[PDB]
Design a protein around this nucleic acid. Structure first.
Ligand SMILES: [Zn+2]
Lengths: 101, 145, 141, 206, 67, 80, 69, 55, 63, 143
RNA sequence: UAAUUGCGAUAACGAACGAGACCUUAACCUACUAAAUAGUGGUGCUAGCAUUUGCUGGUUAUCCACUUCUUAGAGGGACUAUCGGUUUCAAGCCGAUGGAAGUUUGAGGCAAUAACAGGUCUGUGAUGCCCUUAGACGUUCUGGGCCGCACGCGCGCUACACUGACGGAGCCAGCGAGUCUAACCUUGGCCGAGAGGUCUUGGUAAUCUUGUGAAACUCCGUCGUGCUGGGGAUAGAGCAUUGUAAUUAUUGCUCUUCAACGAGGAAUUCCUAGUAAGCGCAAGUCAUCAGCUUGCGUUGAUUACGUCCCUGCCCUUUGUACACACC
């Protein structure tokens, strides 16, 4: 019966949301405390650069944005139940890291 | 409360170290009007020579004026730090000086002449009269007169 | 016990959280009495809901305000909005509707909106100029 | 007067004065009437104000600036030139000082002297431009009351500025003496000199 | 300014033409009706449809339209 | 070794793939088909395979020194 | 150029032009009699220490004073 | 080099200011190849069958 | 001096080559039926009181 | 009926506590109190030479009371100013770390501040006690 | 109408692209879900003053409860809403009231037919052809230059001061960024006027730097209209950091030197509300160097809700011997 932390992050919002729904779902048929997920502020990777490949024309700029979304859920679970969750729940793009402490 | 009731010994423009010192301005800025010496060293000289900071140049008469002048000619003996003077580790002696009213121009021209005689690029630039610090003369420096 | 309520006030970036409870009747900002806020000219501006309402309505409440963000004018406006909202929320939840409605009448009669945040927000800056609408000077020659 | 003393002090001076009447700092916003017609509904003195610092939206629609009370307009016209484009807390301090100098120069109400100054320096007949092939002739034209009030305030503050750029006299003293002369037009105020040259050139060009 | 476009005008005229008895004179009810009897894909567009529908219904109950 | 594994797929709806169309026209132009010929081949192939709009903008110099760009459009294309 | 040191003729003047006008300030003193500012401020401090003038308000930029009654 | 540079009587800001200024400093431009750009400069006229046999 | 207090009824239109001189319909607060056109420099609504020193100009479009 | 430094005004308290610390005087100021400019962002040394360090001491004491734990870097950031870099625009440069650390350790050898865990210095029981007593005498200074 | 935006008139009737719609963001939510990586209240222990119960604190897990304030998933909310007036009585516009919001709700992203002999061969192992290809026009090492100065032009920064400068005191943001098979952001302590240096500490980051305790700003003092304590340009000496290397000052700090400018001619730029303007901060290139640019926040106004007078662009009607299209 080990108390672990499970942090997920991605750039794809709805894929991340259904991953989190799957995690809270399976925790809730096998209840541990309740542990609803907590929402970090979204990190906006801004990259600003020139439109023009050369240095001619009207000086116009661009701002590309990456959005990083990150959530965490705590689980207090045996070993086989931890392994079943962290190996069954898997989707592309969403990087999930599981830590013991 | 600092009204001064003195009548006769207030004096007009006075003399200290080959300079016309204004007699109706504050003592720190009259020392600033003395050449070779600026505001912060003037204030330190007044505070340290125990001269009354609050008032102009009419009193702060002779005996503190010679205390003032001796503290300028030999700052180093009385706990003025070495970094507070204008010239240190000088040229051929290494002991720390402060140049005053005429010695400042005499000795700035002297070390300019020193580097001119060592035939430095700084010397050639000063001889030509162009900008001796690294500066762009392409666009500025017009109308030297 | 402790019949308390929590309200807020929002200027451009200042948030002021005001805790209003039923006690002896004191009024305080950031652990200090409000007669000690330092713009020293907007002392009347923090006095505004006090002197609109009346001291007897303030004579039985303790309001404590915690203050974050924004410049000093943003602080004083967030305080004023937060304590006016605290008065109207306490009077809504504990006392009579004519009392709160007459106070709303006074507030909207004198109002610099007094209870609702200014929707004015700083628009983002565009390229080609150092301001939101101003652009760099051109020469043509 | 029924003061209520709390743990926090809330001093009795502001207690009594601003519980009894919504003043200025300490100045009555009643008993003030616009001495002349043609300027009512625009010079807003019917609603009292404690301090001219208000976050009021005035430039959205047509004439919410005409709805705005006049003392804030005096501050926001004192706000000009690039040295102090921004410092209206300080401008409010200046305006309070001007009102005090008004009180010491004359016992009457400082908002009333402001009203009298605007009334006596609103320019009654301006002159507009016409194409007019040749010398580009101009033609006289009367002025809407809000433009009257606006140009009046502009003349007040520009006269104070030009008379107090490089002088020992402060902005508060200069604006106060300009306000006194504009209340009693004595052919000394910059605002009424500008008004008089406007009427003279318009009467000549009509 | 606030000129309504061909999309909202065309949809509002078709809806008012074929659904006159069920429509009401209020915006809230009418926009719920538009939600149910139209498979519209945009929320702000839905509100615009309902607003022009309500205005045209006001004009219908006041008098005849030439449209 | 063993931490990455490749896999393959036929691409369902192979007709409505823009990179596939560009690759096919690279192939036909390398074969030496006429520009007009082959480009109409792709536009009609896309429209028959079942898209809602298609366009090709072959652009460059072909036989003259001057370079033009003739646009073969068929179907319905949003642009904003 | 002005006079910044009270030579007692400016002193017994300012003692007899306290009642001549109403509005006392630094610039008012400077224009009414030629005193170089700082001495006028010292005179204001002396006169508020013992007031034949009363304060309407004090400010580090400007001080507004009226006669005693 | 060094001694010649310091002993050259020609060099100096004062001598440069003594000399006058030419008009090429205040001339503006010669934009001939932007004034005439529609007209072909290669001279290679594009011909009908090249266009047809190509595009 | 014959100062005249006027009262606008309707606005006629924004004449002026640059487009600032508004034409309005002034009554003169003494006779309901005595009215005339006026050219005004500033911005104008209904129900405001203007002032005239010459009430006999009767002007028209400015070029 | 309840006294705190929050309940007393800033300027009058800071002046009264400066005068109080002048009247005791056990501060052991460093020797270079007249040379310094209190920051590299200044150009003139302080005017009131006889009490500028003690006004600084009163200021630091009030800051330590109002906050949990701050250090010399935070004090330099607070008492820094705008540096006039000539023709270049102004910039925020921190204050004089030497005189800030000297006033911190002067208050420490008085016994007003102490070393707190996780770094920094925090207020002491007797420092807060005498600060509250002076906050009192400033509250009941009314005639 | 912002709009070929829509009414209407009507040999046209229906449509499609562009506009709009759409998306992203800033506004509102006491409504759901939450949260020791965010706060709040209370219960312990403890400090002080008053002790008359209180106020101010601390307290990494002493525990409980909550989500108003922080975050954002699902949603809602505004649609010129209601009324009055005008209009072809329509499209719409003006005002009032309500509401967080009545400027296309503010601001962007993408943006049709097309062209231009517009710019880039110096971004590309994208490139045809040409030139060169070993005394190389390839690559690599050393040094210099790109910064050189009689002068002309363009973008900016500091200023010409008291609506200020100088010294203390008060304290107030937001956008972000930050190190593994290496040397990032640096807290705290200690030395030093300062710049900076040494011991460590924390952070792969809502955890720490950091509440980025920023500047402008407020109060109290000094200065008193003087080329002045405005201004800090030129200029000399020393102390440090970065880097193999600072000389042609890299940059920072200290002292000294104290120029011109007293508001700017002809002209001309930008701008309609959290706007101009003032004021700073972060990121980019970075070992170092920001007077630049991109974003953000603080303080925050005047005047107008029009017109074709000027200047550009569009459409229509006209004229054409032009169609490579007035080059
Ligand atoms: Zn590539």
């Amino acid at each position: 019966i080990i108390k672990i932390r499970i942090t997920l992050t991605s750039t794809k919002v709805k894929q991340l949301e259904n991953v989190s729904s799957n995690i809270v779902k399976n925790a809730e048929q096998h209840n541990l405390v309740k542990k609803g997920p907590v929402r970090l502020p979204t990190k906006v990777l801004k990259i600003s650069t020139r439109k023009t490949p050369n240095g001619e024309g009207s000086k116009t700029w661009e701002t590309y944005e990456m959005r990083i979304h990150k959530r965490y859920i705590d689980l207090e679970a045996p070993v086989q139940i931890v392994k079943r969750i962290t190996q069954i729940t898997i989707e592309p793009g969403v990087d999930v890291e599981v830590v013991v402490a | 409360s600092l009204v001064v009731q003195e009548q006769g010994s207030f004096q007009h423009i006075l003399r200290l170290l080959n300079t016309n010192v204004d007699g109706n301005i504050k003592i720190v800025y009259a020392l600033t009007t003395i050449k070779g010496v600026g505001r912060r060293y003037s204030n330190l000289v007044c505070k340290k020579a125990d001269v009354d900071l609050h008032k102009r140049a009419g009193e702060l008469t002779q005996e503190e004026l010679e205390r003032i002048v001796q503290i300028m000619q030999n700052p180093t003996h009385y706990k003025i730090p070495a970094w507070f003077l204008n010239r240190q580790n000088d040229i051929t002696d290494g002991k720390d000086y402060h140049t005053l009213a005429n010695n400042v121009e005499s000795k700035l021209r002297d070390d300019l002449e020193r580097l001119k005689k060592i035939r430095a690029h700084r010397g050639i630039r000063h001889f030509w009269g162009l900008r001796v610090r690294g500066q762009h003369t392409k666009t500025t420096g017009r109308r030297r007169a | 016990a402790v019949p308390s309520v929590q309200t807020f006030g929002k200027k451009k970036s200042a948030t002021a959280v005001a805790h209003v409870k039923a006690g002896k009747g004191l009024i305080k900002v950031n652990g200090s009495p409000i007669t000690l806020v330092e713009p020293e000219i907007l002392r009347f501006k923090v006095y505004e809901p006090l002197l609109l309402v009346g001291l007897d309505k303030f004579s039985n409440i303790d309001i404590r305000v915690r203050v974050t963000g924004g410049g000093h004018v943003s602080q004083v406006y967030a305080i004023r909005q937060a304590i006016a909202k605290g008065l109207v929320a306490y009077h809504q939840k504990y006392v009579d509707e004519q009392s709160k409605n007459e106070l709303k009448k006074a507030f909207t009669s004198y109002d610099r909106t007094l209870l609702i945040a200014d929707s004015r927000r700083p628009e983002p800056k565009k390229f080609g100029g150092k301001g939101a609408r101003s652009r760099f000077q051109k020469s043509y020659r | 007067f029924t003061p209520v003393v709390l743990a926090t002090p809330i001093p009795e001076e502001v207690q009594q004065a601003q519980t009894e009447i919504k003043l200025f700092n300490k100045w009555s916003f009643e008993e003030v009437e616009v001495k002349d017609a043609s300027l009512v509904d625009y010079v807003q003195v019917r609603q009292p104000i404690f301090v001219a610092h208000t976050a009021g939206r005035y430039a959205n629609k047509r004439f919410r600036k005409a709805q705005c009370p006049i003392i804030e307009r005096l501050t926001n016209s004192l706000m000009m030139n690039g040295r102090n484009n921004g410092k209206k807390l300080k401008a409010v301090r200046i305006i309070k000082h001007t009102l005090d100098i008004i009180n010491v120069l004359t016992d009457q109400n400082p908002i009333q002297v402001v009203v009298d100054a605007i009334t006596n320096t609103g320019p009654r007949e301006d002159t507009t431009r016409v194409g007019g092939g040749g010398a580009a002739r101009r033609q006289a034209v009367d002025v809407s009351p809000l433009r009257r009030v606006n140009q009046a305030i502009a003349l007040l503050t520009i006269g104070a500025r030009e008379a107090a750029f490089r002088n020992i006299k402060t902005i508060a003293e200069t604006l106060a003496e300009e306000l006194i002369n504009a209340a009693k037009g004595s052919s000394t105020s910059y605002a009424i000199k500008k008004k008089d040259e406007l009427e003279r050139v318009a009467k000549s060009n009509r | 300014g606030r000129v309504r476009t061909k999309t909202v005008k065309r949809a509002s005229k078709a809806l008012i033409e074929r659904y006159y008895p069920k429509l009401t004179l209020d915006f809230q009810t009418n926009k719920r009706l538009c939600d149910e009897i139209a498979t519209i894909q945009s929320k702000r567009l839905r509100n615009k449809i309902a607003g022009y529908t309500t205005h045209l219904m006001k004009r219908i109950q006041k008098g005849p339209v030439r449209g | 070794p063993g931490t990455i594994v490749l896999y393959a797929e036929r691409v369902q709806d192979r007709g409505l793939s823009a990179v596939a169309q560009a690759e096919s026209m690279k192939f036909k132009l390398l074969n030496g088909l006429a520009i007009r010929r082959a480009a109409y081949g792709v536009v009609r192939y896309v429209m028959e395979s079942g898209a809602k709009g298609c366009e090709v903008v072959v652009s460059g110099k072909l036989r003259a020194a001057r370079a033009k760009a003739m646009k073969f459009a068929d179907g319905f294309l949003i642009h904003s | 150029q002005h006079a910044v040191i009270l030579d007692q003729e400016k002193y017994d003047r300012i003692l007899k032009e306290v009642p001549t006008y109403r509005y006392v300030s630094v610039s008012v003193l400077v224009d009414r009699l030629k005193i170089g500012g700082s001495l006028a401020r010292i005179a204001l401090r002396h006169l508020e220490k013992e007031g034949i003038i009363k304060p309407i308000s004090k400010h580090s930029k400007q001080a507004i004073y009226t006669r005693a009654t | 080099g060094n001694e010649g540079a310091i002993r050259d009587k020609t060099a100096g800001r004062r001598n440069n200011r003594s000399k006058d200024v030419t008009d090429s400093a205040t001339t503006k431009k010669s934009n001939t190849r932007r004034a005439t750009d529609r007209h072909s400069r290669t001279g290679k006229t594009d011909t009908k069958k090249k266009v047809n046999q190509g595009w | 001096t014959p100062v005249t207090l006027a009262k606008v009824i309707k606005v006629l239109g924004r004449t002026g080559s640059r487009g600032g001189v508004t034409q309005v319909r002034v009554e003169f607060l003494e006779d309901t039926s005595r009215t005339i056109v006026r050219n005004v420099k500033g911005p104008v609504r209904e129900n405001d009181i203007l002032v005239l020193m010459e009430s006999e100009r009767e002007a028209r479009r400015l070029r | 009926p309840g006294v705190s430094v929050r309940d007393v005004a800033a300027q009058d308290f800071i002046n009264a506590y400066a005068s109080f610390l002048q009247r005791q005087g056990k501060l052991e100021v460093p020797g270079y109190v007249d040379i310094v400019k209190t920051s590299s962002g200044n150009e003139m040394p302080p005017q009131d030479a006889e009490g500028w360090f003690y006004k600084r001491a009163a200021s630091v004491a009030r800051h330590i009371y109002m906050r949990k734990q701050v250090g010399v870097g935070k004090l330099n950031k607070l008492y820094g100013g705008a540096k006039s870099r000539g023709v270049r625009p102004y910039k925020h440069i921190d204050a004089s770390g030497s005189i800030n650390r000297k006033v911190l350790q002067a208050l420490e050898k008085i016994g007003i501040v102490e070393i707190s865990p996780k770094g920094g210095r925090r207020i002491s029981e007797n420092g807060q006690r005498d600060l509250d007593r002076i906050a009192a005498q400033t509250l009941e200074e009314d005639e």
